[PDB]
Design a protein around this ligand. Structure first.
Ligand SMILES: CC(C)CCC[C@@H](C)CCC[C@@H](C)CCC[C@@H](C)CCOC[C@@H](CO)OCC[C@H](C)CCC[C@H](C)CCC[C@H](C)CCCC(C)C
Ligand SMILES: CC(C)CCC[C@@H](C)CCC[C@@H](C)CCC[C@@H](C)CCOC[C@@H](CO)OCC[C@H](C)CCC[C@H](C)CCC[C@H](C)CCCC(C)C
Ligand SMILES: CC(C)CCC[C@@H](C)CCC[C@@H](C)CCC[C@@H](C)CCOC[C@@H](CO)OCC[C@H](C)CCC[C@H](C)CCC[C@H](C)CCCC(C)C
Ligand SMILES: CC(C)CCC[C@@H](C)CCC[C@@H](C)CCC[C@@H](C)CCOC[C@@H](CO)OCC[C@H](C)CCC[C@H](C)CCC[C@H](C)CCCC(C)C
Ligand SMILES: CC(C)CCC[C@@H](C)CCC[C@@H](C)CCC[C@@H](C)CCOC[C@@H](CO)OCC[C@H](C)CCC[C@H](C)CCC[C@H](C)CCCC(C)C
Ligand SMILES: CC(C)CCC[C@@H](C)CCC[C@@H](C)CCC[C@@H](C)CCOC[C@@H](CO)OCC[C@H](C)CCC[C@H](C)CCC[C@H](C)CCCC(C)C
Ligand SMILES: *C/C=C(C)/C=C/C=C(C)/C=C/C1=C(C)CCCC1(C)C
Ligand SMILES: *C/C=C(C)/C=C/C=C(C)/C=C/C1=C(C)CCCC1(C)C
Ligand SMILES: *C/C=C(C)/C=C/C=C(C)/C=C/C1=C(C)CCCC1(C)C
Ligand SMILES: CCCCCCCCCCCCCCC
Ligand SMILES: CCCCCCCCCCCCCCC
Ligand SMILES: CCCCCCCCCCCCCCC
Ligand SMILES: CCCCCCCCCCCCCCC
Ligand SMILES: CCCCCCCCCCCCCCC
Ligand SMILES: CCCCCCCCCCCCCCC
Ligand SMILES: CCCCCCCCCCCCCC
Ligand SMILES: CCCCCCCCCCCCCC
Ligand SMILES: CCCCCCCCCCCCC
Ligand SMILES: CCCCCCCCCCCCC
Ligand SMILES: CCCCCCCCCCCCC
Ligand SMILES: CCCCCCCCCCC
Ligand SMILES: CCCCCCCCCCC
Ligand SMILES: CCCCCCCCCCC
Ligand SMILES: CCCCCCCCCC
Ligand SMILES: CCCCCCCCCC
Ligand SMILES: CCCCCCCCCC
Ligand SMILES: CCCCCCCCC
Ligand SMILES: CCCCCCCCC
Ligand SMILES: CCCCCCCCC
Ligand SMILES: CCCCCCCC
Ligand SMILES: CCCCCCCC
Ligand SMILES: CCCCCCCC
Ligand SMILES: CCCCCCCC
Ligand SMILES: CCCCCCCC
Ligand SMILES: CCCCCCCC
Ligand SMILES: CCCCCCCC
Lengths: 231, 231, 231
């Protein structure tokens, strides 16, 4: 484990995702509202999945070597197995908050799968220049997601209860800022141009992951928007 | 790229799926009917997924070598990753058109997963004679799907609006004819008996894919069956 | 095939899953109740999936070698591909029986995915002591599932029709007893401590699989709880 300088950030990430999972699990014990139960189930699964994948990276299972640039490059593939399941769950939290229609939910989840799937292909591609073709396709899929979150959901939240509109607006802004950083870290990190070393890259993804999952969840599950209007 | 004679058909397929995706995306911009939005989302995702997998084959990522018959045989595995997601989406288009019940939808999607999954196992199997055992199981799963589309959905469409009944009947006939060709191309192509060479096999799958996805989508999204009855 | 002593139990399992699939398929022909169709579709898919994965193990495709303990250990990875899809389908049978809320269904299916996913990682892990870390995480996920089936569903079934309450109680008890045996067989078998040899381990999993899928299905599909109350 300790033979890799980035191990400290993988261990911290593992701990923070595990602690986040347990807090949400305990906090959700005393909840019977069927609407609130939906948000607790979605939001608790997110850091639980991330916990297992951070642990796999810490123990060395989620790491492979990819030859490109005449070098064997360490690629943590477990990140994409994490994101494949956690990013659509996070979008479902937002879509259920605004009572989005089914067709829009399917478009979001499908574009998200394309985003993560093409990012994985780009991470494992051995022809250096082709890695950035996949990065560009994946980034186009992300821009579609961000467009929908702004010019489809925002207008839908305003016609909703005030507390669900204000909570959505906050979580929307958090998501757009944090998610946009991921393609940048990829491009300048060891998967892309190799400007930033792997140990610093790992620290950046850990800060982003914890903020986008645990921080996101703390804002959502403390809001009254997750409960139905009741007397 | 150009070192493979089949590259021209992979490049054409990539272009036609990309163009198809963009047309459906633009055409769906001016749509607010929640029913129509469902069909546009399903139908636009189909060629978008196929685009990415054709590109992976063009660039050489979606290709592996499988030893059988005393030879290293080029097997494009990316086809099955495509079909795993696009064939159930196409069946969902048909099932939603006739307002199929949930139990029937689950049976269709499950049989479809078995069809594609066993076809993938057959494509990667190293014992030559066993490849055709998997082909037979996969073909049995397809025949179940075709039976349901005829002796379960057809009777349901007649009790529906006339425009949804006539549109379903057309898309049903297109699907049964085109899908039935796939097991035949597999059997006589490089995955099976090896009668037809890979470059011709690739041309045939490209014609079938574009027809079953883009051609299918053009018929559906030009129909009024996708809109609810409104004044 | 016959070069492996466990082949006899893989062949028996294949036959019993295939026969089970055909019986459920025939029995479900004469069913039009939309509620009953749901249970028949879920319950017939379970042994059909298991059939294909037992066949892959029989023919040698679903087997790999994992080095640990200074030895190349035969690991049947196809079991986890089976369980990944069949265990959530079995939980869906139970959840639909008691009309569970959506949030609870998602929590069950998500915990089940974590259970199977971490068990697969543990089966393929090359550092011997780490294999049991994954076993423990997977077992914690199972205990969560069992808790929900007892202290969330049981109370919900009592407020239901008497026949659905008594049928659920029976299937609940069958599930908790049979599922609990799996982590024990893993721990003492070739994936874990290696006390029980592989051929005996394979026999035990076959008895458990057939009972948990075909036996489970025979109890459910003979009950009147799967039909709506009708005159
Ligand atoms: C009902 O809706 C509320 C349940 O949602 C919340 C239910 C959760 C979604 C269930 C998923 C958690 C499982 C219990 C998994 C247990 C293993 C975890 C990874 C444990 C990690 C923390 C600890 C080991 C440090
Ligand atoms: C509606 C939305 C959900 C739609 C989703 C969008 C999606 C279509 C976007 C594209 C996804 C696609 C790129 C997934 C590729 C997975 C692949 C990286 C797995 C590893 O295989 C890659 C190479 C080794 O580098 O295999 C070496 C050769 C091996 C012999 C490969 C044989 C196994 C194949 C991988 C079998 C295909 C399985 C499916 C891809 C499983 C789904 C994986 C997940 C990442 C989507
Ligand atoms: C709301 O419902 C309508 C949206 O459906 C339609 C929405 C679509 C389903 C969203 C999926 C498309 C994404 C925007 C993916 C973008 C990358 C594409 C693969 C681009 C391919 C064409 C071009 C690069 C040649
Ligand atoms: C309700 C419906 C959706 C049900 C679906 C029906 C489905 C059950 C039908 C059978 C599907 C099954 C054959 C999928 C097999 C995937 C497999 C080809 C992936 C590549 O692995 C094959 C060998 C190399 O040749 O791995 C070499 C050895 C490696 C060490 C393998 C270890 C990884 C395992 C593959 C882990 C299992 C992952 C799941 C199979 C992922 C789903 C893939 C998709 C193709 C279903
Ligand atoms: C409508 O709801 C009822 C259909 O459910 C029941 C429908 C089933 C869920 C459909 C799935 C079965 C498919 C027909 C697959 C056929 C291949 C099987 C694996 C055959 C195995 C048995 C035989 C080959 C020994
Ligand atoms: C809501 C719920 C459904 C959530 C589900 C819970 C889930 C997150 C729990 C953890 C699942 C995770 C451990 C799955 C790992 C699959 C992995 C074993 C496949 C084989 O790859 C392992 C190594 C060889 O040993 O690959 C060698 C290196 C290769 C180069 C690997 C590159 C391919 C990657 C495997 C791509 C990721 C694909 C996804 C993991 C596909 C889903 C598989 C299924 C088992 C979940
Ligand atoms: C909890 C994890 C989250 C919210 C991860 C989000 C990840 C992304 C938005 C990743 C995006 C990428 C691109 C847009 C292209 C480059 C490759 C990716 C996958 C890093
Ligand atoms: C857009 C792609 C489509 C509609 C693909 C359809 C593919 C099939 C219907 C494939 C069927 C197969 C068999 C029936 C057995 C032989 C292997 C397959 C997977 C080619
Ligand atoms: C039809 C198959 C069924 C119902 C299989 C159930 C399997 C389990 C409940 C497996 C549980 C495991 C653990 C709890 C940890 C050890 C590894 C597993 C996956 C065997
Ligand atoms: C979206 C965030 C990207 C900003 C990356 C900042 C990295 C600064 C760290 C110093 C770079 C290390 C280079 C010298 C080793
Ligand atoms: C009462 C609110 C705080 C509860 C404690 C939460 C502990 C989980 C770890 C959170 C750290 C990361 C927060 C986002 C920066
Ligand atoms: C379902 C369509 C299958 C028909 C295949 C027709 C192939 C004819 C092309 C000529 C065969 C090439 C053999 C000589 C190289
Ligand atoms: C107005 C209808 C035609 C629009 C142009 C569609 C261009 C997408 C490519 C379609 C070619 C394949 C059609 C099926 C044979
Ligand atoms: C949950 C069931 C686990 C019980 C396992 C009993 C196995 C007894 C078979 C004899 C053990 C073989 C050891 C000598 C070869
Ligand atoms: C009339 C009920 C029996 C029908 C025959 C079922 C045959 C399928 C194989 C069942 C054997 C396994 C039963 C569970 C132990
Ligand atoms: C490729 C993996 C995608 C599945 C991720 C799991 C979450 C799915 C959310 C589905 C939302 C409901 C759509 C109607
Ligand atoms: C990782 C694979 C999980 C999917 C298994 C297929 C069954 C899914 C059941 C979904 C139940 C409905 C949830 C609302
Ligand atoms: C185009 C939709 C408007 C909202 C999206 C904001 C774009 C942020 C740019 C992200 C940069 C990634 C490289
Ligand atoms: C048996 C259901 C009737 C409709 C299915 C038509 C069968 C077409 C044969 C396909 C040939 C594939 C080898
Ligand atoms: C803790 C929830 C109560 C019901 C679960 C029964 C636990 C059975 C123990 C299984 C042993 C697996 C190692
Ligand atoms: C080795 C660098 C080659 C540059 C390729 C950049 C491709 C980016 C595509 C974005 C449209
Ligand atoms: C090398 C050819 C061996 C023939 C096997 C055919 C199997 C087909 C099974 C269809 C029932
Ligand atoms: C080689 C045996 C090492 C023992 C590790 C046991 C780990 C079990 C963790 C359960 C909390
Ligand atoms: C609940 C605390 C979980 C912390 C265990 C993971 C941290 C790795 C320490 C080496
Ligand atoms: C929108 C046009 C997309 C065409 C790019 C793919 C074709 C491959 C050319 C080499
Ligand atoms: C319907 C009977 C299915 C039996 C075939 C599988 C058994 C393997 C025999 C070698
Ligand atoms: C993106 C930063 C999240 C901050 C988490 C703190 C929330 C406390 C209510
Ligand atoms: C299967 C052939 C499809 C033909 C596509 C043309 C549709 C234009 C309306
Ligand atoms: C767990 C044992 C199941 C027994 C199956 C027999 C059911 C006949 C109704
Ligand atoms: C990490 C355990 C949390 C302790 C309870 C927090 C207040 C519900
Ligand atoms: C109005 C809410 C502002 C939230 C933005 C937070 C950016 C990290
Ligand atoms: C909408 C604000 C985008 C912020 C992008 C930050 C990328 C590091
Ligand atoms: C009555 C519609 C006929 C459609 C069949 C088209 C076959 C390619
Ligand atoms: C229902 C007509 C079937 C046509 C099969 C064509 C196979 C090449
Ligand atoms: C009251 C029903 C008892 C069922 C338990 C069966 C254990 C195999
Ligand atoms: C609730 C009874 C548990 C039985 C466990 C059996 C494990 C072999």
């Amino acid at each position: 484990i300790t033979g890799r300088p980035e191990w400290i950030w993988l261990a911290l990430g593992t701990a923070l995702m595990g602690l986040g999972t347990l807090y949400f699990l305990v906090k959700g014990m005393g909840v019977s509202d069927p609407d609130a139960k939906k948000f607790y189930a979605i939001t608790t699964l997110v850091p639980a999945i991330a916990f297992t994948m951070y642990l796999s990276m810490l123990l060395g299972y989620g790491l492979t070597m990819v030859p490109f640039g005449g070098e064997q490059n360490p690629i943590y593939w477990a990140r994409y197995a994490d994101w494949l399941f956690t990013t659509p769950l996070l979008l479902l939290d937002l879509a259920l908050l605004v009572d989005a229609d089914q067709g829009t939910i399917l478009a979001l989840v499908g574009a998200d799968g394309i985003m993560i799937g093409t990012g994985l292909v780009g991470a494992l591609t051995k022809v250096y220049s082709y890695r950035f073709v996949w990065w560009a396709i994946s980034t186009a899929a992300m821009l579609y997601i961000l467009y929908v979150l702004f010019f489809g959901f925002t207008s839908k939240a305003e016609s909703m209860r005030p507390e669900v509109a204000s909570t959505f607006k906050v979580l929307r802004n958090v998501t757009v800022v944090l998610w946009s950083a991921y393609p940048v870290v990829w491009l300048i990190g060891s998967e892309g141009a190799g400007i930033v070393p792997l140990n610093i890259e790992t620290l950046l993804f850990m800060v982003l992951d914890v903020s986008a999952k645990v921080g996101f969840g703390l804002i959502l599950l403390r809001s009254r928007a997750i409960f139905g209007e009741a007397e």
